[PDB]
Amino acid sequence: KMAMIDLAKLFLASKITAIEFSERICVERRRLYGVKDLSPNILNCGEELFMAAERFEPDADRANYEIDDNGLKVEVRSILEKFKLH
């Protein structure tokens, strides 16, 4: 379904935090994993959201490739736009 996309939208609307999004996105991804008859565009968008969240690290000592709250927000928006799932 659009569960992962909606979660992304909830996060962009700041209804849920970066930490909340990074955790729930894992729950949702697992739920849709393997689920037949899934739109490639939707599946791939979810996967990129999943990887974007994997790069999120709230700590100030995060790695050079990791991102903070802002940044996760920009990448998530960029990802939804890439797949045209605003």
Binding site: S22, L43, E47, E48, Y65
Partner: protein
């Protein structure tokens, strides 16, 4: 590092939604069992973590990323139907 990655525990056969000393150790054992499994072999790297080595199990489809220094970074289940997954399977780039 194990606590912040518990979000992926569910990919390693642990559905406990609770994150406590008990469930964490279960996750720790789940990771050890993955790495020790005869069918788990080195395959690719997690580029961003330049120098990292990933260990894949084609049965469970799980990968576990280890840093150059040998420390556990993260891990999750590969989805062969998604581009990222297919790309990893074909090129080893995670």
């Amino acid at each position: 590092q194990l606590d912040k990655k518990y979000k992926h525990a569910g990919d390693f056969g642990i559905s406990d939604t609770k994150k406590n000393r008990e469930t964490l150790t279960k996750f720790r054992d789940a990771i050890e069992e993955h790495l020790s499994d005869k069918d788990t072999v080195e395959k690719g790297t997690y580029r961003r973590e330049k120098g990292s080595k990933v260990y894949f199990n084609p049965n469970t489809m799980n990968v576990v990323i280890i840093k150059s220094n040998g420390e556990f970074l993260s891990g999750w289940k590969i989805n062969p139907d998604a581009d990222n997954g297919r790309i990893y399977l074909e090129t080893g780039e995670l």
